[PDB]
Amino acid sequence: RLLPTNLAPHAVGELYRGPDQLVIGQREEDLAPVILDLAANPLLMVFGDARSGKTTLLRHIIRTVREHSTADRVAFTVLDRRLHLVDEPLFPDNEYTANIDRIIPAMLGLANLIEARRPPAGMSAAELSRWTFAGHTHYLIIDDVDQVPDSPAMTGPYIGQRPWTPLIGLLAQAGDLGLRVIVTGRATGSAHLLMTSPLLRRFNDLQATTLMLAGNPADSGKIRGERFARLPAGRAILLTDSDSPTYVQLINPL
Ligand SMILES: Nc1ncnc2c1ncn2[C@@H]1O[C@H](COP(=O)(O)OP(=O)(O)OP(=O)(O)O)[C@@H](O)[C@H]1O
Ligand SMILES: [Mg+2]
């Protein structure tokens, strides 16, 4: 079927189908809504070369989660060095930073928060009793994650420390501890990053949902056997747990 080139946020029915169930576009087969289930798969990585739609998809998610949530149930943490998401409102007191030097402590403190939700040792088949957690589902949004140096810090109070270290051990249980993580990066270089970045290698080892926006069919490498294609803005290959790769068009907000 013929996908659109500019998909309006009202052409797809209800955008919010329940907590963590977000319509993000239409699929090529039948133009049916594409529904991101962040409770089932809390991790999403989006790869695309210049101006293909990474940040716009982040904006769409933030706006859709925010419009149908209350501040005492949902919190965002947004890391955005290029500042293209300053526009988008969060909830009160929510961390938005573009400062490469605030990332290390911000992640340490987010990690301490999610870590405190884990169940005690000594349980064994008594936790699958709605153990859950008391408070916010926390959406961690990292635009252009491939542009944050992931090497030990050379200067400042956190010398020798790396930005993503406290996050890694959380990713496997993010769905039980009220954590979602959404990141974006260029298409070129992405396959190598999937192998060398501790953060993105863990995303891939955990089969994170992947959106492959436009990229180079030669250089950008293979993700789960798929090459990038030269696509218009917002057109992506969607890789999930349950279906084979799917062409989709993402909603263009505003
Ligand atoms: N889902 C969409 N549908 C139609 N057009 C889009 C879509 N997403 C992005 N665009 C077009 O591409 C432009 C750039 O989008 P965006 O800033 O999200 O790209 P990016 O991949 O984040 O760019 P950069 O590589 O600079 O970070 C938008 O201004 C719009 O013109
Ligand atoms: Mg961008």
Residue numbers in the entry: 1060 to 1313
The authors write:
EccC, the motor subunit of T7SS, is essential to assemble a stable membrane complex for the secretion process. It contains a two-pass transmembrane domain, an unknown function domain (DUF), and three Fts-SpoIIIE-like ATPase domains (ATPase1, ATPase2, and ATPase3). In this study, we have provided high-resolution crystal structures of ATPase3 domains of EccC proteins from Mtb, all in complex with ATP. In our structures, ATP and a magnesium ion bind to the nucleotide-binding site in a similar manner.
To explain structure-function differences amongst EccC-ATPase3 domains, the crystal structures of Mtb ATPase3 from ESX-2, -3, -5 were determined at 2.20 Å, 1.97 Å and 2.00 Å resolution, respectively. Though the sequence identities are only 20%~30% amongst the four ATPase3 domains, their atomic structures can be superimposed and have r.m.s.d. values in the range 0.99~2.02 Å by comparing Cɑ atom pairs. Here, our structural data showed that the recognition pocket in each EccC-ATPase3 is different. The signal binding pocket of MtEccC3-ATPase3 is much wider than MtEccCb1-ATPase3; the pocket of MtEccC5-ATPase3 is much flatter while MtEccC2-ATPase3 has a shallow recognition pocket. The different shapes and compositions of signal recognition pockets further imply that different T7SS subtypes could specifically recognize individual substrates.
